[PDB]
């Protein structure tokens, strides 16, 4: 399992970067304020992981 987590650390990093960039773009009303949903999805994905 340690090797499996070492494998998944890259997806963890990808999630971190995506969450940071979603947070930086909370207030773009494009696509009927889709950026808010993107940020919320990133936050809850971080929580679940």
């Amino acid at each position: 399992d340690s090797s499996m987590l070492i494998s998944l650390t890259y997806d963890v990093i990808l999630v971190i970067l995506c969450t940071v960039y979603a947070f930086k773009t909370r207030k773009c009303p494009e696509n009927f304020n889709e950026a808010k949903f993107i940020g919320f999805t990133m936050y809850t994905t971080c929580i679940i992981w």
Partner: protein, 347 residues
């Protein structure tokens, strides 16, 4: 002792006369759109001619065009049956009627306040369709009712403008200071900037006074002082078009934990910045050269509509970056007679 503007139609000779191309915008109320029409009888039964004012708003971005969609909304539409085969006359209308004769029929509109001023987004070299922005059109149709399709053989189109000019009251002079505490314990660093006044006439110099007091051991690498322009769009949830229209990356190294005050001059102008597509410029009649957008002011109590343009001087210091924004307004003074609505020397 004055002059008006005239347009004509082939089939019906519907000569539409308008007092002026533009119509200034007092915050409380917009000047009336009053004019007349000569309607020679080119018919036997089709005795109706209608005048329609439309404050159209067109928009589309580069990637929006790439995908193949551009938005357009009719913010305001007014239809008046100017020919009674209501609307009491005015002085200019009376003079025009005295000139014209019996068939002269008046038509009067009022633009409800807080409607966006005539601002057009600058098209790119590839952009060749209808100009994107807020454009006001007055049209005349010779038909019966609205069931018949609007025929180009009879309609008359003229492009009008709705603009604002700088108020006499300067308003509060913009000024802003920010002190940032660095990660090294709580060590402050103060930046302060001030402007000459709040309303700037187009082309006038901006003498941003900037003073920095660094309470740290670091050094300021460079000072990027720019004039950012924000063109908010209030339809279809489109993002805020931000675009720097003037800049100066003036580099100055200052002694650690010391003070340094001076003034940096910036002037917005279209010569250096004629490429940034989507930029907001004042109303263009037919692709004529115009200045930057006149900074709209919603002094009424108001509703966000159309394209809301504003200008703010942003001062940034490197090492991350200490940024300060000083909003202001860029607008023409009150003109004496009228703008020529074109390059003053034609060719």
């Amino acid at each position: 002792g004055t002059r008006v503007f005239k347009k004509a139609s082939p089939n019906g000779k519907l000569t539409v006369y308008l007092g002026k191309r533009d119509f200034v915008d007092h915050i409380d109320l917009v000047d009336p759109v009053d004019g007349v029409v000569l309607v020679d009888p080119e018919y036997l039964k089709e005795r109706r001619v209608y005048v329609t004012l439309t404050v159209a708003f067109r928009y589309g971005r580069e990637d929006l065009d790439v995908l193949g969609l551009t938005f357009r909304k009719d913010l305001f539409v007014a239809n008046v049956q100017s020919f009674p085969p209501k609307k009491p006359l005015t002085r200019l209308q009376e003079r025009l009627i005295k000139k014209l004769g019996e068939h002269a029929y008046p038509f009067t509109f009022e633009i409800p306040p807080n409607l966006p001023s005539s601002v057009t987004l600058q098209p790119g070299p590839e952009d060749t369709g209808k100009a994107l922005g807020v454009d006001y059109e007055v049209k005349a149709f010779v038909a019966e009712n609205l069931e018949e399709k609007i025929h180009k053989r009879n309609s008359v189109r003229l492009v009008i403008e709705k603009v604002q000019y700088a108020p006499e009251r300067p308003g509060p002079q913009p000024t802003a200071e920010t002190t940032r505490q660095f990660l090294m314990s709580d060590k402050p660093l103060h930046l302060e900037a001030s402007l000459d006044k709040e309303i700037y006439y187009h082309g006038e110099p901006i003498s941003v006074n900037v003073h920095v007091t660094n309470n740290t051991n670091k050094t300021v690498k460079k000072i990027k002082i720019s004039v950012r322009q924000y063109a908010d769009i209030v339809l279809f949830n489109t993002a805020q078009y931000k675009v720097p229209v003037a800049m100066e990356e003036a580099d100055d190294t200052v002694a650690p934990s010391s003070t340094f005050s001076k003034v940096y001059t910036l002037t917005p102008f279209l010569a250096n910045n004629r490429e940034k597509r989507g930029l907001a410029l004042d109303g263009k009649l037919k692709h004529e050269d115009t200045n930057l957008a006149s900074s709209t002011l919603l002094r009424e109590g108001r509703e966000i509509l159309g394209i809301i343009v504003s200008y703010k001087v942003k001062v940034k210091l490197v090492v991350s970056d200490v940024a300060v924004e000083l909003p202001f307004t860029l607008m023409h003074p009150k003109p004496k007679e009228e703008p020529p609505h074109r390059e003053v020397p034609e060719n």
